Design an enzyme around this catalytic site. Structure first.
Site, PDB file in Angstrom:
ATOM      1  N   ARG A  36       0.669  -1.173  -0.139  1.00 32.50           N
ATOM      2  CA  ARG A  36       0.254  -0.306  -0.214  1.00 32.50           C
ATOM      3  C   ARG A  36       0.562   0.826  -0.106  1.00 32.50           C
ATOM      4  NH1 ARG A  36      -4.533   2.296   0.279  1.00 32.50           N
ATOM      5  NH2 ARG A  36      -5.457   2.003   2.786  1.00 32.50           N
ATOM      6  N   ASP A  61      -3.734  -1.282   8.445  1.00 34.32           N
ATOM      7  CA  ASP A  61      -3.189   0.357   8.815  1.00 34.32           C
ATOM      8  C   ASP A  61      -2.751  -0.433  10.141  1.00 34.32           C
ATOM      9  OD1 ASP A  61      -4.175   1.409   6.648  1.00 34.32           O
ATOM     10  OD2 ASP A  61      -5.606   2.183   8.279  1.00 34.32           O
ATOM     11  N   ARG A 245      -7.217  16.161   0.574  1.00 38.92           N
ATOM     12  CA  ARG A 245      -7.615  14.105   0.651  1.00 38.92           C
ATOM     13  C   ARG A 245      -8.971  15.344   1.443  1.00 38.92           C
ATOM     14  NH1 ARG A 245      -7.205   9.087   2.561  1.00 38.92           N
ATOM     15  NH2 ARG A 245      -9.771   8.518   3.283  1.00 38.92           N
ATOM     16  N   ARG A 308     -12.521   2.378  -3.852  1.00 34.77           N
ATOM     17  CA  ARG A 308     -11.442   3.794  -5.036  1.00 34.77           C
ATOM     18  C   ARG A 308     -11.447   3.496  -6.421  1.00 34.77           C
ATOM     19  NH1 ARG A 308      -7.659   4.564   0.470  1.00 34.77           N
ATOM     20  NH2 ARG A 308     -10.187   6.046   1.558  1.00 34.77           N
ATOM     21  N   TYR A 341      -4.978   4.501  -3.528  1.00 34.79           N
ATOM     22  CA  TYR A 341      -3.177   5.316  -3.314  1.00 34.79           C
ATOM     23  C   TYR A 341      -2.514   5.481  -4.907  1.00 34.79           C
ATOM     24  CZ  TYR A 341      -4.694   6.752   1.356  1.00 34.79           C
ATOM     25  OH  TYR A 341      -5.142   7.182   2.094  1.00 34.79           O
ATOM     26  N   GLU A 360      -2.142   1.909  -6.849  1.00 38.90           N
ATOM     27  CA  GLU A 360      -2.631  -0.055  -5.886  1.00 38.90           C
ATOM     28  C   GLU A 360      -3.809  -0.420  -6.225  1.00 38.90           C
ATOM     29  OE1 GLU A 360      -3.880   2.600  -2.401  1.00 38.90           O
ATOM     30  OE2 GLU A 360      -2.775   1.120  -1.092  1.00 38.90           O
TER      31      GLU A 360
HETATM   32  C1  LIG Z   1      -1.194   6.533   9.341  1.00 43.18           C
HETATM   33  C2  LIG Z   1      -2.324   5.782   8.521  1.00 43.18           C
HETATM   34  O1  LIG Z   1      -3.149   5.480   9.658  1.00 43.18           O
HETATM   35  N1  LIG Z   1      -2.619   6.250   7.684  1.00 43.18           N
HETATM   36  C3  LIG Z   1      -4.078   5.283   7.152  1.00 43.18           C
HETATM   37  C4  LIG Z   1      -4.761   6.053   7.140  1.00 43.18           C
HETATM   38  C5  LIG Z   1      -5.280   7.077   8.114  1.00 43.18           C
HETATM   39  O2  LIG Z   1      -5.714   5.811   8.701  1.00 43.18           O
HETATM   40  C6  LIG Z   1      -6.466   7.501   7.951  1.00 43.18           C
HETATM   41  O3  LIG Z   1      -5.763   8.373   6.675  1.00 43.18           O
HETATM   42  C7  LIG Z   1      -6.765   8.699   8.798  1.00 43.18           C
HETATM   43  O4  LIG Z   1      -5.753   9.715  10.056  1.00 43.18           O
HETATM   44  O5  LIG Z   1      -6.018   5.346   6.243  1.00 43.18           O
HETATM   45  C8  LIG Z   1      -5.900   5.424   5.150  1.00 43.18           C
HETATM   46  P1  LIG Z   1      -6.984   4.854   4.342  1.00 43.18           P
HETATM   47  O6  LIG Z   1      -7.336   3.556   5.239  1.00 43.18           O
HETATM   48  O7  LIG Z   1      -8.036   6.185   3.939  1.00 43.18           O
HETATM   49  O8  LIG Z   1      -7.223   4.250   2.858  1.00 43.18           O
HETATM   50  C9  LIG Z   1      -4.678   4.412   4.832  1.00 43.18           C
HETATM   51  C10 LIG Z   1      -3.186   4.468   5.476  1.00 43.18           C
HETATM   52  O9  LIG Z   1      -2.386   3.877   5.991  1.00 43.18           O
HETATM   53  K   LIG Z   2      -7.535   4.610   7.702  1.00 48.39           K
END
Ligand SMILES: CC(=O)N[C@H]1[C@H]([C@H](O)[C@H](O)CO)O[C@H](P(=O)(O)O)C[C@@H]1O
Ligand SMILES: [K+]
EC number: 3.2.1.18
Length: 381
Positions: A36, A61, A245, A308, A341, A360
């Site tokens: 990712r 995550d 975003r 997405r 992404y 991705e």
């Molecule tokens: C540090 C971290 O958690 N990065 C994650 C973030 C984060 O949780 C959100 O932006 C809220 O802060 O989510 C994204 P997404 O799930 O929207 O694909 C994946 C990232 O790897």
């Molecule tokens: K997240």
């Protein structure tokens, strides 16, 4: 040069740790399970360097993650891969380094590739949940650099943790995801996202950190509204303009006083719709004569959810405010476990221009050469 290739294959890559032992992931045959957050940088030698979370066990995550790097010297046809940054390995289930943001720059004459990732070890919840401490004790933001065209990376001893602590209202900070930039004056700029302490009304804010040497960093005095916080910054005349975003329409603000105050930037503000939840998007500038054009990639998200779908390339006319879809390069529904992404990379080496994307694709990271689209993008001014 190649039109399309797979950089990192979900359940198809094997990495080794610092001691040379194989990292046994949850993928088939003990491979890394999911990849990712791709970030990409192209050097003056034409070398393509791609970074991405190597989420060994799960796409979640809060899991065991290392930062992988892939390097290609033949236009994206073949890739040499390895781990660029290893997590601390304190907790076999949660230790991680994640969400890369890179910069390719010439620092005092030396071409350097910088990579910045967030680091956690015991936190089992999303980073935005930790707002009691300034900063969170589990958090750290590390920076690595390569001075040999992406072959080897070394940790940079920085003052980033110090400036965050000194600020006193920031629980954690992370790069904007994708790529940062080197300004015309030579300063390095990393767009950033930050979780504020519990007492601050606004949970998230966006800003940037800058440096001349890549070792001593500074934070401006002001803060930009947070929204979905992931963002990229572009330099436009005597301004820094970000692209953030947001669930629904993307937001764009500009600073004319180097981070003290921000106002909405009409040419890009609310121009692209990412729908439900929002997604990270890549925004860079491309020169056209003595003018600039902004190229942007983010997901159309036709299902209006976490899938997405349709990661697309857009051109932004910075003067008129016109937007045009240039190419839906990944016209597919993504994996809801983690998708959407991307990262663009434009470069003109001598007389050769290239526009590449990394994105991705169902757990894997794919590469596409979008150079054929440059004449169309460059005419958007
Ligand atoms: C540090 C971290 O958690 N990065 C994650 C973030 C984060 O949780 C959100 O932006 C809220 O802060 O989510 C994204 P997404 O799930 O929207 O694909 C994946 C990232 O790897
Ligand atoms: K997240």
């Amino acid at each position: 040069t190649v039109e399309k290739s797979v950089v990192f294959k979900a359940e198809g890559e094997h990495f080794t740790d610092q001691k040379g032992n194989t990292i046994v992931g949850s993928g088939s045959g003990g491979t890394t399970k999911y990849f990712r957050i791709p970030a990409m940088c192209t050097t003056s030698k034409g070398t393509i360097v791609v970074f991405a979370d190597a989420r060994h066990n799960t796409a979640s995550d809060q899991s065991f993650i290392d930062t992988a790097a892939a390097r290609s010297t033949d236009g994206g046809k073949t890739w040499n891969k390895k781990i660029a940054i290893y997590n601390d390995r304190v907790n076999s289930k949660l230790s991680r380094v994640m969400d890369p943001t890179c910069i390719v720059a010439n620092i005092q004459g030396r071409e350097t590739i910088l990579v910045m990732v967030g680091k956690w070890n015991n936190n089992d919840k999303t980073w935005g949940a930790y707002r009691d401490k300034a900063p969170d004790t589990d958090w750290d933001l590390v920076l690595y650099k390569s001075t040999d065209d992406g072959v080897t990376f070394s940790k940079v001893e920085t003052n980033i943790h110090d400036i965050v602590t000194k600020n006193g209202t920031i629980s954690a900070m992370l790069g904007g995801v994708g790529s940062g930039l080197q300004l015309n004056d030579g300063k390095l700029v990393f767009p950033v996202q930050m979780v504020r302490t519990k007492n601050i009304t606004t949970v998230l804010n966006t800003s940037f950190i800058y440096s001349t040497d890549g070792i001593t960093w500074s934070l401006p005095s002001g803060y930009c509204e947070g929204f979905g916080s992931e963002n990229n910054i572009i330099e436009f005349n005597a301004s820094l303009v970000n692209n953030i975003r947001n669930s629904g329409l993307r937001r764009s603000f500009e600073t004319k006083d180097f981070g003290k105050t921000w106002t909405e930037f009409p040419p890009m503000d609310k121009k692209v719709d990412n729908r439900n939840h929002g997604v990270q998007g890549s925004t860079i500038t491309i020169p056209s004569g003595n003018k600039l054009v902004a190229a942007h990639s983010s997901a159309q998200n036709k299902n209006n959810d976490y899938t997405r779908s349709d990661i697309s390339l857009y051109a932004h006319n910075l003067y008129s405010g016109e937007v045009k879809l240039i190419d839906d390069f990944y016209p597919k529904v993504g994996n809801a476990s983690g998708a959407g992404y991307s990262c663009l990379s434009y470069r003109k080496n001598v007389d050769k221009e290239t526009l590449y994307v990394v994105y991705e694709a169902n757990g894997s990271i794919e590469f596409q050469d979008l150079s054929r689209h440059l004449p169309v993008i460059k005419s958007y001014n």
